[PDB]
Curated annotation (Swiss-Prot), chain A:
<feature type="glycosylation site" description="N-linked (GlcNAc...) asparagine">
    <location>
        <position position="383"/>
    </location>
</feature>
<comment type="function">
    <text>Ionotropic glutamate receptor that functions as a ligand-gated cation channel, gated by L-glutamate and glutamatergic agonists such as alpha-amino-3-hydroxy-5-methyl-4-isoxazolepropionic acid (AMPA), quisqualic acid, and kainic acid. L-glutamate acts as an excitatory neurotransmitter at many synapses in the central nervous system and plays an important role in fast excitatory synaptic transmission.</text>
</comment>
<feature type="glycosylation site" description="N-linked (GlcNAc...) asparagine">
    <location>
        <position position="346"/>
    </location>
</feature>
<feature type="glycosylation site" description="N-linked (GlcNAc...) asparagine">
    <location>
        <position position="376"/>
    </location>
</feature>
<feature type="topological domain" description="Extracellular">
    <location>
        <begin position="1"/>
        <end position="390"/>
    </location>
</feature>
<feature type="disulfide bond">
    <location>
        <begin position="54"/>
        <end position="306"/>
    </location>
</feature>
<protein>
    <recommendedName>
        <fullName>Glutamate receptor 2</fullName>
    </recommendedName>
</protein>
<feature type="glycosylation site" description="N-linked (GlcNAc...) asparagine">
    <location>
        <position position="232"/>
    </location>
</feature>
<comment type="similarity">
    <text>Belongs to the glutamate-gated ion channel (TC 1.A.10.1) family. GRIA2 subfamily.</text>
</comment>
Curated annotation (Swiss-Prot), chain B:
<comment type="function">
    <text>Ionotropic glutamate receptor that functions as a ligand-gated cation channel, gated by L-glutamate and glutamatergic agonists such as alpha-amino-3-hydroxy-5-methyl-4-isoxazolepropionic acid (AMPA), quisqualic acid, and kainic acid. L-glutamate acts as an excitatory neurotransmitter at many synapses in the central nervous system and plays an important role in fast excitatory synaptic transmission.</text>
</comment>
<comment type="similarity">
    <text>Belongs to the glutamate-gated ion channel (TC 1.A.10.1) family. GRIA2 subfamily.</text>
</comment>
<comment type="subunit">
    <text>Homotetramer or heterotetramer of pore-forming glutamate receptor subunits. Tetramers may be formed by the dimerization of dimers. May interact with MPP4. Forms a ternary complex with GRIP1 and CSPG4. Interacts with ATAD1 in an ATP-dependent manner. ATAD1-catalyzed ATP hydrolysis disrupts binding to ATAD1 and to GRIP1 and leads to AMPAR complex disassembly. Interacts with GRIP2. Interacts with GRIP1. Interacts with NSF via its C-terminus. Interacts with CACNG2, PICK1 and GRIP2. Interacts with GRIA1 and SYNDIG1. Part of a complex containing GRIA2, NSF and NAPA and/or NAPB.</text>
</comment>
<protein>
    <recommendedName>
        <fullName>Glutamate receptor 2</fullName>
    </recommendedName>
</protein>
Length: 390, 167
Protein backbone atom coordinates (compact mmCIF):
# COMPACT_ATOMS: atom_id res chain seq x y z
CA UNK A 1 0.00 0.00 0.00
CA UNK A 2 1.75 3.12 -1.26
CA UNK A 3 0.99 5.80 1.34
CA UNK A 4 1.90 9.37 0.40
CA UNK A 5 3.50 11.14 3.37
CA UNK A 6 5.21 14.45 4.05
CA UNK A 7 8.83 15.49 3.74
CA UNK A 8 9.11 19.06 5.04
CA UNK A 9 12.71 18.86 6.22
CA UNK A 10 14.47 22.16 6.96
CA UNK A 11 17.62 22.72 4.93
CA UNK A 12 20.74 21.85 6.88
CA UNK A 13 18.95 19.15 8.91
CA UNK A 14 20.18 16.25 6.80
CA UNK A 15 21.45 14.19 9.75
CA UNK A 16 17.79 13.99 10.77
CA UNK A 17 16.98 13.11 7.16
CA UNK A 18 19.78 10.52 7.29
CA UNK A 19 18.21 8.76 10.27
CA UNK A 20 14.85 9.29 8.57
CA UNK A 21 16.18 7.15 5.73
CA UNK A 22 17.40 4.57 8.25
CA UNK A 23 13.80 4.48 9.41
CA UNK A 24 12.97 4.04 5.74
CA UNK A 25 15.50 1.19 5.79
CA UNK A 26 14.45 -0.34 9.12
CA UNK A 27 10.71 0.29 9.21
CA UNK A 28 9.52 -0.01 5.62
CA UNK A 29 7.42 -3.06 4.80
CA UNK A 30 5.55 -4.80 2.01
CA UNK A 31 2.31 -4.49 3.99
CA UNK A 32 2.29 -0.79 3.11
CA UNK A 33 4.77 1.41 1.26
CA UNK A 34 5.84 4.73 2.70
CA UNK A 35 5.88 7.30 -0.11
CA UNK A 36 7.74 10.42 1.05
CA UNK A 37 7.11 13.74 -0.67
CA UNK A 38 10.45 15.28 0.24
CA UNK A 39 10.44 19.08 0.29
CA UNK A 40 13.70 20.54 1.64
CA UNK A 41 12.57 24.09 2.37
CA UNK A 42 13.41 26.65 5.04
CA UNK A 43 11.17 26.41 8.08
CA UNK A 44 11.37 30.13 8.92
CA UNK A 45 9.44 31.42 5.88
CA UNK A 46 5.83 30.59 6.69
CA UNK A 47 4.99 31.49 3.09
CA UNK A 48 7.39 28.76 1.96
CA UNK A 49 5.94 26.54 4.68
CA UNK A 50 2.47 27.14 3.24
CA UNK A 51 3.65 26.34 -0.30
CA UNK A 52 5.01 22.88 0.52
CA UNK A 53 2.04 22.30 2.84
CA UNK A 54 -0.61 22.97 0.21
CA UNK A 55 1.39 21.14 -2.45
CA UNK A 56 1.22 18.05 -0.26
CA UNK A 57 -2.43 18.91 0.28
CA UNK A 58 -2.62 19.00 -3.52
CA UNK A 59 -0.68 15.73 -3.47
CA UNK A 60 -3.24 14.15 -1.15
CA UNK A 61 -0.87 12.87 1.52
CA UNK A 62 -2.33 11.05 4.50
CA UNK A 63 0.19 12.35 7.05
CA UNK A 64 2.77 15.13 7.02
CA UNK A 65 6.19 14.89 8.62
CA UNK A 66 8.63 17.69 9.32
CA UNK A 67 9.84 20.26 11.79
CA UNK A 68 8.21 23.54 12.69
CA UNK A 69 9.71 26.89 13.61
CA UNK A 70 8.30 29.37 16.10
CA UNK A 71 7.60 31.26 12.87
CA UNK A 72 5.46 28.26 11.89
CA UNK A 73 3.94 27.20 15.23
CA UNK A 74 1.19 29.68 14.41
CA UNK A 75 1.04 28.18 10.92
CA UNK A 76 0.95 24.40 11.42
CA UNK A 77 -1.54 24.49 14.29
CA UNK A 78 -3.86 26.71 12.24
CA UNK A 79 -3.47 24.73 9.01
CA UNK A 80 -3.29 21.09 10.16
CA UNK A 81 -6.00 21.68 12.75
CA UNK A 82 -8.40 23.05 10.13
CA UNK A 83 -7.65 20.71 7.22
CA UNK A 84 -7.62 17.82 9.75
CA UNK A 85 -4.32 16.35 8.57
CA UNK A 86 -2.27 14.73 11.32
CA UNK A 87 1.22 16.19 11.59
CA UNK A 88 4.26 14.49 13.08
CA UNK A 89 7.00 16.71 14.44
CA UNK A 90 10.29 16.27 16.29
CA UNK A 91 10.25 19.97 17.21
CA UNK A 92 9.61 21.77 20.47
CA UNK A 93 6.39 21.40 22.50
CA UNK A 94 3.53 23.72 21.64
CA UNK A 95 2.21 26.40 23.96
CA UNK A 96 -1.43 25.31 23.61
CA UNK A 97 -3.11 21.94 23.24
CA UNK A 98 -3.54 21.82 19.49
CA UNK A 99 -5.18 18.94 17.57
CA UNK A 100 -3.35 16.99 14.84
CA UNK A 101 0.00 17.74 16.49
CA UNK A 102 2.12 14.68 17.25
CA UNK A 103 5.32 15.85 18.90
CA UNK A 104 8.52 13.90 19.52
CA UNK A 105 10.28 16.30 21.89
CA UNK A 106 8.63 15.92 25.31
CA UNK A 107 8.31 18.55 28.01
CA UNK A 108 11.49 19.77 29.70
CA UNK A 109 10.36 22.09 32.52
CA UNK A 110 9.33 19.23 34.82
CA UNK A 111 12.83 17.80 34.65
CA UNK A 112 14.27 21.32 34.69
CA UNK A 113 12.53 22.68 37.79
CA UNK A 114 13.07 19.43 39.70
CA UNK A 115 16.78 19.81 38.94
CA UNK A 116 16.78 23.34 40.35
CA UNK A 117 14.87 21.97 43.35
CA UNK A 118 17.66 19.40 43.57
CA UNK A 119 20.41 22.03 43.42
CA UNK A 120 18.22 24.24 45.69
CA UNK A 121 19.21 27.39 43.82
CA UNK A 122 17.59 30.69 44.76
CA UNK A 123 19.42 33.30 42.68
CA UNK A 124 20.85 32.23 39.34
CA UNK A 125 21.21 33.75 35.90
CA UNK A 126 19.32 32.25 32.97
CA UNK A 127 20.38 33.10 29.45
CA UNK A 128 17.81 32.12 26.88
CA UNK A 129 17.46 31.88 23.14
CA UNK A 130 14.01 32.99 22.05
CA UNK A 131 14.08 30.79 18.94
CA UNK A 132 12.54 27.72 20.61
CA UNK A 133 9.80 29.82 22.18
CA UNK A 134 9.53 31.29 25.66
CA UNK A 135 7.35 28.74 27.49
CA UNK A 136 10.31 27.47 29.51
CA UNK A 137 11.10 31.11 30.24
CA UNK A 138 7.49 31.44 31.35
CA UNK A 139 7.97 28.21 33.32
CA UNK A 140 10.89 29.42 35.41
CA UNK A 141 9.22 32.74 36.23
CA UNK A 142 6.13 30.99 37.56
CA UNK A 143 8.35 29.07 39.95
CA UNK A 144 10.28 32.28 40.63
CA UNK A 145 7.12 33.78 42.10
CA UNK A 146 6.58 30.72 44.29
CA UNK A 147 10.15 29.89 45.30
CA UNK A 148 11.13 33.57 45.89
CA UNK A 149 13.74 33.27 43.15
CA UNK A 150 15.88 36.12 41.84
CA UNK A 151 16.49 34.75 38.36
CA UNK A 152 18.13 37.11 35.85
CA UNK A 153 16.83 36.34 32.36
CA UNK A 154 18.64 37.89 29.38
CA UNK A 155 17.85 37.11 25.75
CA UNK A 156 20.78 36.14 23.56
CA UNK A 157 19.16 35.17 20.26
CA UNK A 158 19.07 38.65 18.76
CA UNK A 159 22.85 39.04 18.94
CA UNK A 160 24.43 39.00 15.49
CA UNK A 161 27.04 36.45 14.43
CA UNK A 162 29.64 39.15 13.77
CA UNK A 163 29.55 40.66 17.27
CA UNK A 164 28.79 37.62 19.41
CA UNK A 165 32.26 38.07 20.86
CA UNK A 166 32.31 41.46 22.56
CA UNK A 167 28.69 41.59 23.68
CA UNK A 168 29.28 38.33 25.54
CA UNK A 169 32.32 39.74 27.34
CA UNK A 170 30.02 42.63 28.21
CA UNK A 171 27.37 40.09 29.21
CA UNK A 172 29.30 38.01 31.74
CA UNK A 173 30.81 41.21 33.12
CA UNK A 174 27.22 42.31 33.68
CA UNK A 175 26.75 38.93 35.35
CA UNK A 176 29.73 39.89 37.50
CA UNK A 177 27.78 42.97 38.52
CA UNK A 178 25.75 40.39 40.43
CA UNK A 179 28.82 38.06 40.63
CA UNK A 180 26.75 35.08 39.49
CA UNK A 181 28.20 31.57 39.60
CA UNK A 182 25.05 29.73 38.51
CA UNK A 183 24.03 30.09 34.87
CA UNK A 184 21.52 27.82 33.15
CA UNK A 185 21.85 28.08 29.39
CA UNK A 186 18.94 27.91 26.97
CA UNK A 187 20.48 27.94 23.50
CA UNK A 188 20.84 25.88 20.35
CA UNK A 189 23.65 23.31 20.18
CA UNK A 190 25.77 25.68 18.10
CA UNK A 191 24.83 28.67 20.26
CA UNK A 192 25.56 26.63 23.38
CA UNK A 193 29.05 25.84 22.07
CA UNK A 194 29.67 29.44 20.97
CA UNK A 195 28.94 30.94 24.39
CA UNK A 196 30.87 28.24 26.27
CA UNK A 197 33.88 29.10 24.09
CA UNK A 198 33.42 32.66 25.32
CA UNK A 199 33.28 31.29 28.88
CA UNK A 200 36.53 29.53 27.96
CA UNK A 201 37.90 32.87 26.72
CA UNK A 202 37.15 34.54 30.07
CA UNK A 203 37.75 31.46 32.22
CA UNK A 204 34.45 31.08 34.06
CA UNK A 205 34.68 27.31 33.57
CA UNK A 206 36.81 27.20 36.73
CA UNK A 207 35.77 25.88 40.15
CA UNK A 208 33.10 27.92 41.92
CA UNK A 209 30.88 28.13 38.84
CA UNK A 210 28.00 25.85 37.98
CA UNK A 211 26.25 25.47 34.64
CA UNK A 212 23.20 23.52 33.48
CA UNK A 213 22.49 22.84 29.80
CA UNK A 214 18.73 22.88 29.19
CA UNK A 215 18.23 20.53 26.26
CA UNK A 216 17.80 16.83 25.61
CA UNK A 217 21.17 16.80 23.85
CA UNK A 218 23.52 17.14 26.80
CA UNK A 219 25.75 14.47 25.27
CA UNK A 220 25.45 16.10 21.84
CA UNK A 221 27.53 19.12 22.83
CA UNK A 222 31.29 19.33 23.22
CA UNK A 223 32.13 18.41 26.80
CA UNK A 224 35.89 17.92 26.41
CA UNK A 225 36.48 21.68 26.15
CA UNK A 226 35.23 22.27 29.71
CA UNK A 227 35.63 18.85 31.33
CA UNK A 228 38.85 19.80 33.11
CA UNK A 229 38.24 23.45 33.98
CA UNK A 230 36.55 23.27 37.37
CA UNK A 231 32.92 24.29 36.86
CA UNK A 232 30.31 21.57 37.23
CA UNK A 233 28.16 21.04 34.15
CA UNK A 234 24.75 19.36 34.30
CA UNK A 235 22.10 18.54 31.74
CA UNK A 236 19.46 16.22 30.37
CA UNK A 237 19.75 13.29 27.98
CA UNK A 238 16.77 11.47 26.49
CA UNK A 239 18.89 9.32 24.14
CA UNK A 240 21.10 7.15 26.34
CA UNK A 241 23.78 5.37 24.32
CA UNK A 242 24.32 2.62 26.90
CA UNK A 243 21.18 0.80 25.75
CA UNK A 244 21.89 -2.15 23.48
CA UNK A 245 18.91 -1.20 21.31
CA UNK A 246 20.60 2.17 20.91
CA UNK A 247 23.95 0.39 20.53
CA UNK A 248 22.57 -1.70 17.65
CA UNK A 249 21.71 1.59 15.97
CA UNK A 250 25.13 3.16 16.71
CA UNK A 251 26.99 0.12 15.33
CA UNK A 252 25.02 0.70 12.14
CA UNK A 253 25.20 4.52 12.45
CA UNK A 254 29.00 4.79 12.40
CA UNK A 255 29.20 2.29 9.53
CA UNK A 256 26.76 4.37 7.48
CA UNK A 257 28.24 6.19 4.50
CA UNK A 258 28.62 9.91 5.04
CA UNK A 259 28.27 10.60 1.31
CA UNK A 260 25.00 8.67 1.05
CA UNK A 261 23.69 9.53 4.54
CA UNK A 262 25.00 12.99 5.45
CA UNK A 263 25.78 13.45 9.12
CA UNK A 264 25.56 9.71 9.77
CA UNK A 265 29.21 8.53 9.81
CA UNK A 266 29.67 9.59 13.44
CA UNK A 267 30.10 7.98 16.84
CA UNK A 268 26.98 9.56 18.36
CA UNK A 269 23.72 11.06 17.11
CA UNK A 270 21.69 14.18 17.84
CA UNK A 271 18.48 13.50 19.72
CA UNK A 272 16.58 15.37 17.00
CA UNK A 273 17.89 12.83 14.50
CA UNK A 274 17.07 10.01 16.92
CA UNK A 275 13.48 11.21 17.35
CA UNK A 276 13.22 11.46 13.56
CA UNK A 277 14.20 7.79 13.45
CA UNK A 278 11.81 7.19 16.36
CA UNK A 279 8.96 8.86 14.47
CA UNK A 280 9.17 6.41 11.56
CA UNK A 281 8.74 3.60 14.10
CA UNK A 282 5.56 5.36 15.23
CA UNK A 283 4.32 5.94 11.67
CA UNK A 284 4.97 2.31 10.69
CA UNK A 285 3.13 0.97 13.74
CA UNK A 286 0.35 3.46 12.93
CA UNK A 287 -0.38 2.13 9.45
CA UNK A 288 0.20 -1.39 10.73
CA UNK A 289 -2.61 -0.59 13.16
CA UNK A 290 -4.64 1.14 10.45
CA UNK A 291 -4.20 -2.08 8.50
CA UNK A 292 -5.14 -3.87 11.73
CA UNK A 293 -8.15 -1.55 11.93
CA UNK A 294 -8.81 -2.48 8.25
CA UNK A 295 -10.03 1.10 7.76
CA UNK A 296 -9.60 2.32 4.20
CA UNK A 297 -8.19 5.81 4.68
CA UNK A 298 -7.37 6.16 0.99
CA UNK A 299 -8.67 9.65 0.35
CA UNK A 300 -8.09 10.71 -3.25
CA UNK A 301 -5.16 12.94 -4.13
CA UNK A 302 -7.56 15.55 -5.53
CA UNK A 303 -7.92 17.48 -2.29
CA UNK A 304 -6.84 20.35 -4.51
CA UNK A 305 -6.30 23.87 -3.27
CA UNK A 306 -5.98 24.50 0.45
CA UNK A 307 -7.55 27.92 -0.27
CA UNK A 308 -10.98 26.39 -0.90
CA UNK A 309 -13.64 28.50 0.80
CA UNK A 310 -14.85 26.61 2.78
CA UNK A 311 -12.06 24.01 2.84
CA UNK A 312 -13.65 20.64 3.59
CA UNK A 313 -11.90 18.25 6.01
CA UNK A 314 -11.42 14.54 5.41
CA UNK A 315 -12.62 12.35 8.26
CA UNK A 316 -10.10 9.53 7.90
CA UNK A 317 -7.30 11.88 8.96
CA UNK A 318 -9.19 12.50 12.19
CA UNK A 319 -9.16 8.74 12.82
CA UNK A 320 -5.42 8.73 12.05
CA UNK A 321 -5.00 11.17 14.95
CA UNK A 322 -7.08 8.83 17.13
CA UNK A 323 -4.80 5.89 16.34
CA UNK A 324 -1.53 7.87 16.53
CA UNK A 325 -2.29 8.95 20.10
CA UNK A 326 -2.92 5.27 20.89
CA UNK A 327 0.44 4.18 19.43
CA UNK A 328 2.59 2.94 22.32
CA UNK A 329 6.02 1.87 21.06
CA UNK A 330 9.45 1.57 22.58
CA UNK A 331 12.09 3.57 20.78
CA UNK A 332 15.49 5.16 21.20
CA UNK A 333 13.90 7.75 23.51
CA UNK A 334 12.43 5.05 25.75
CA UNK A 335 8.79 4.41 26.53
CA UNK A 336 6.47 6.48 24.34
CA UNK A 337 2.87 7.13 25.34
CA UNK A 338 0.61 9.96 24.22
CA UNK A 339 -2.18 12.07 25.66
CA UNK A 340 -5.30 13.21 23.83
CA UNK A 341 -3.30 16.16 22.45
CA UNK A 342 -0.18 14.44 21.09
CA UNK A 343 2.12 15.26 24.01
CA UNK A 344 4.51 12.50 24.99
CA UNK A 345 3.86 10.90 28.37
CA UNK A 346 5.53 8.07 30.33
CA UNK A 347 8.92 9.18 29.02
CA UNK A 348 12.07 9.09 31.14
CA UNK A 349 14.75 11.79 30.97
CA UNK A 350 18.21 10.67 32.07
CA UNK A 351 19.93 13.47 33.97
CA UNK A 352 23.57 13.42 32.88
CA UNK A 353 26.28 15.43 34.61
CA UNK A 354 29.78 16.08 33.29
CA UNK A 355 32.41 14.99 35.78
CA UNK A 356 36.18 14.53 35.53
CA UNK A 357 35.68 11.06 34.05
CA UNK A 358 33.05 12.42 31.67
CA UNK A 359 29.27 12.72 31.59
CA UNK A 360 27.77 10.65 34.38
CA UNK A 361 24.20 9.98 35.42
CA UNK A 362 22.96 10.99 38.86
CA UNK A 363 19.32 10.07 38.26
CA UNK A 364 16.50 9.71 35.79
CA UNK A 365 13.44 11.93 35.52
CA UNK A 366 9.95 10.49 35.80
CA UNK A 367 6.67 12.17 34.97
CA UNK A 368 4.97 11.14 38.24
CA UNK A 369 7.98 10.42 40.46
CA UNK A 370 9.90 13.42 39.30
CA UNK A 371 13.49 12.93 40.43
CA UNK A 372 14.67 9.43 41.27
CA UNK A 373 18.40 9.56 41.95
CA UNK A 374 20.39 6.68 40.52
CA UNK A 375 22.63 5.08 43.13
CA UNK A 376 25.31 4.31 40.56
CA UNK A 377 27.91 5.57 43.00
CA UNK A 378 31.70 5.42 42.70
CA UNK A 379 31.67 8.27 45.30
CA UNK A 380 33.38 10.48 42.69
CA UNK A 381 36.59 8.45 43.29
CA UNK A 382 37.93 11.17 45.68
CA UNK A 383 36.85 14.02 47.93
CA UNK A 384 38.36 16.77 45.72
CA UNK A 385 40.57 18.39 48.41
CA UNK A 386 38.16 20.61 50.40
CA UNK A 387 39.21 24.33 50.19
CA UNK A 388 40.04 25.88 53.57
CA UNK A 389 40.29 29.65 53.40
CA UNK A 390 41.84 31.79 56.13
CA UNK B 1 -9.40 56.27 -9.36
CA UNK B 2 -10.99 53.21 -7.77
CA UNK B 3 -8.25 51.67 -5.62
CA UNK B 4 -8.94 48.21 -4.23
CA UNK B 5 -7.80 48.00 -0.60
CA UNK B 6 -8.02 45.52 2.25
CA UNK B 7 -10.67 45.01 4.91
CA UNK B 8 -9.40 42.31 7.28
CA UNK B 9 -11.24 43.50 10.38
CA UNK B 10 -11.46 41.06 13.30
CA UNK B 11 -15.00 40.24 14.36
CA UNK B 12 -16.09 42.26 17.36
CA UNK B 13 -13.89 45.24 16.40
CA UNK B 14 -16.68 47.24 14.78
CA UNK B 15 -15.96 50.45 16.71
CA UNK B 16 -12.67 50.47 14.81
CA UNK B 17 -14.65 49.74 11.65
CA UNK B 18 -17.02 52.56 12.62
CA UNK B 19 -14.18 55.09 12.77
CA UNK B 20 -12.81 53.43 9.64
CA UNK B 21 -16.03 54.47 7.92
CA UNK B 22 -15.66 57.99 9.34
CA UNK B 23 -12.29 57.97 7.61
CA UNK B 24 -14.23 56.81 4.57
CA UNK B 25 -16.50 59.80 5.21
CA UNK B 26 -13.77 62.33 6.01
CA UNK B 27 -10.89 61.23 3.79
CA UNK B 28 -12.50 59.91 0.60
CA UNK B 29 -12.05 62.05 -2.50
CA UNK B 30 -12.87 62.25 -6.19
CA UNK B 31 -9.14 62.25 -7.01
CA UNK B 32 -9.10 58.54 -6.16
CA UNK B 33 -11.76 56.21 -4.80
CA UNK B 34 -11.01 53.91 -1.89
CA UNK B 35 -12.50 50.49 -2.66
CA UNK B 36 -12.54 48.39 0.53
CA UNK B 37 -12.69 44.60 0.29
CA UNK B 38 -14.23 44.08 3.71
CA UNK B 39 -13.55 40.65 5.20
CA UNK B 40 -14.75 40.34 8.80
CA UNK B 41 -12.85 37.23 9.87
CA UNK B 42 -11.24 36.07 13.10
CA UNK B 43 -7.62 37.13 13.40
CA UNK B 44 -6.58 34.11 15.50
CA UNK B 45 -7.01 31.47 12.78
CA UNK B 46 -3.99 31.98 10.53
CA UNK B 47 -5.66 29.63 8.04
CA UNK B 48 -8.61 32.03 7.90
CA UNK B 49 -6.11 34.90 7.79
CA UNK B 50 -4.47 33.26 4.76
CA UNK B 51 -7.83 32.78 3.02
CA UNK B 52 -8.84 36.46 3.13
CA UNK B 53 -5.24 37.43 2.37
CA UNK B 54 -4.98 35.39 -0.82
CA UNK B 55 -8.52 36.32 -1.85
CA UNK B 56 -7.44 39.96 -1.77
CA UNK B 57 -4.30 38.83 -3.57
CA UNK B 58 -6.70 37.24 -6.05
CA UNK B 59 -8.61 40.53 -5.96
CA UNK B 60 -5.47 42.47 -6.84
CA UNK B 61 -5.61 45.04 -4.05
CA UNK B 62 -2.85 47.64 -3.86
CA UNK B 63 -2.73 47.83 -0.05
CA UNK B 64 -4.15 45.68 2.74
CA UNK B 65 -5.59 47.05 5.97
CA UNK B 66 -6.41 45.15 9.13
CA UNK B 67 -5.19 43.97 12.48
CA UNK B 68 -2.87 41.09 13.21
CA UNK B 69 -2.77 38.63 16.09
CA UNK B 70 0.33 37.14 17.66
CA UNK B 71 -1.01 34.06 15.87
CA UNK B 72 -0.63 36.07 12.66
CA UNK B 73 2.53 38.10 13.34
CA UNK B 74 4.38 35.11 11.91
CA UNK B 75 1.90 35.09 9.03
CA UNK B 76 1.67 38.70 7.85
CA UNK B 77 5.41 39.36 8.00
CA UNK B 78 6.07 36.19 6.00
CA UNK B 79 3.29 36.80 3.46
CA UNK B 80 3.32 40.57 2.91
CA UNK B 81 7.12 40.64 2.94
CA UNK B 82 7.32 38.00 0.20
CA UNK B 83 4.44 39.10 -2.03
CA UNK B 84 5.63 42.72 -1.53
CA UNK B 85 2.21 44.10 -0.60
CA UNK B 86 2.30 46.96 1.89
CA UNK B 87 0.21 46.27 4.98
CA UNK B 88 -1.27 48.86 7.32
CA UNK B 89 -1.96 47.79 10.88
CA UNK B 90 -3.17 49.41 14.10
CA UNK B 91 -1.90 46.40 16.07
CA UNK B 92 1.05 45.94 18.38
CA UNK B 93 4.68 46.58 17.34
CA UNK B 94 6.55 43.70 15.76
CA UNK B 95 9.52 41.97 17.36
CA UNK B 96 11.72 42.27 14.27
CA UNK B 97 12.12 44.93 11.60
CA UNK B 98 9.89 43.51 8.89
CA UNK B 99 9.31 45.13 5.48
CA UNK B 100 5.83 46.11 4.25
CA UNK B 101 4.64 46.59 7.84
CA UNK B 102 3.11 49.98 8.57
CA UNK B 103 2.10 50.05 12.22
CA UNK B 104 -0.11 52.56 14.02
CA UNK B 105 0.61 51.57 17.62
CA UNK B 106 4.04 53.00 18.52
CA UNK B 107 6.52 51.61 21.01
CA UNK B 108 5.56 51.65 24.69
CA UNK B 109 8.66 50.47 26.60
CA UNK B 110 10.46 53.80 26.25
CA UNK B 111 7.59 55.57 27.96
CA UNK B 112 7.16 52.61 30.31
CA UNK B 113 10.73 52.32 31.61
CA UNK B 114 11.08 56.09 31.94
CA UNK B 115 7.96 56.02 34.10
CA UNK B 116 9.50 53.36 36.34
CA UNK B 117 12.66 55.48 36.42
CA UNK B 118 10.36 58.33 37.45
CA UNK B 119 8.72 56.30 40.22
CA UNK B 120 12.19 54.85 41.03
CA UNK B 121 10.75 51.41 41.73
CA UNK B 122 13.10 48.53 42.49
CA UNK B 123 10.82 45.63 43.42
CA UNK B 124 7.37 45.51 41.87
CA UNK B 125 5.05 42.85 40.53
CA UNK B 126 4.20 42.78 36.83
CA UNK B 127 1.21 40.80 35.66
CA UNK B 128 1.18 40.29 31.93
CA UNK B 129 -1.13 39.00 29.24
CA UNK B 130 0.82 37.04 26.65
CA UNK B 131 -1.69 37.84 23.90
CA UNK B 132 0.02 41.04 22.73
CA UNK B 133 3.42 39.33 22.67
CA UNK B 134 6.19 39.31 25.24
CA UNK B 135 8.57 42.01 23.95
CA UNK B 136 7.58 44.40 26.73
CA UNK B 137 8.10 41.50 29.12
CA UNK B 138 11.51 41.08 27.52
CA UNK B 139 11.95 44.86 27.83
CA UNK B 140 11.44 45.02 31.59
CA UNK B 141 13.75 42.07 32.26
CA UNK B 142 16.59 43.70 30.33
CA UNK B 143 16.26 46.72 32.60
CA UNK B 144 15.87 44.37 35.57
CA UNK B 145 19.39 43.09 34.93
CA UNK B 146 20.74 46.64 34.77
CA UNK B 147 18.70 48.34 37.50
CA UNK B 148 19.00 45.37 39.94
CA UNK B 149 15.23 44.97 39.86
CA UNK B 150 13.28 42.20 41.58
CA UNK B 151 10.28 42.17 39.27
CA UNK B 152 7.80 39.31 39.70
CA UNK B 153 6.27 38.45 36.34
CA UNK B 154 3.22 36.16 36.28
CA UNK B 155 1.22 35.33 33.15
CA UNK B 156 -2.53 35.80 33.39
CA UNK B 157 -3.74 35.15 29.84
CA UNK B 158 -4.09 31.39 30.17
CA UNK B 159 -6.64 31.68 32.99
CA UNK B 160 -10.11 30.61 31.86
CA UNK B 161 -13.12 32.91 31.98
CA UNK B 162 -14.99 30.60 34.36
CA UNK B 163 -12.32 30.58 37.08
CA UNK B 164 -10.85 34.06 36.74
CA UNK B 165 -12.30 34.74 40.18
CA UNK B 166 -10.63 32.34 42.58
CA UNK B 167 -7.24 32.10 40.89
Amino acid sequence: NSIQIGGLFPRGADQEYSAFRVGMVQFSTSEFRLTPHIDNLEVANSFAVTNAFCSQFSRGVYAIFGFYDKKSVNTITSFCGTLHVSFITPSFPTDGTHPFVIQMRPDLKGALLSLIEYYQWDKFAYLYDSDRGLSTLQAVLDSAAEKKWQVTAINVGNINNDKKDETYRSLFQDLELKKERRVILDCERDKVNDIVDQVITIGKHVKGYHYIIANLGFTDGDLLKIQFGGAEVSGFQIVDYDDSLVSKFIERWSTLEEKEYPGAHTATIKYTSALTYDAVQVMTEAFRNLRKQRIEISRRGNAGDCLANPAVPWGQGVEIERALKQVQVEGLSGNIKFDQNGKRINYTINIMELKTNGPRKIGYWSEVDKMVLTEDDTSGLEQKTVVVTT
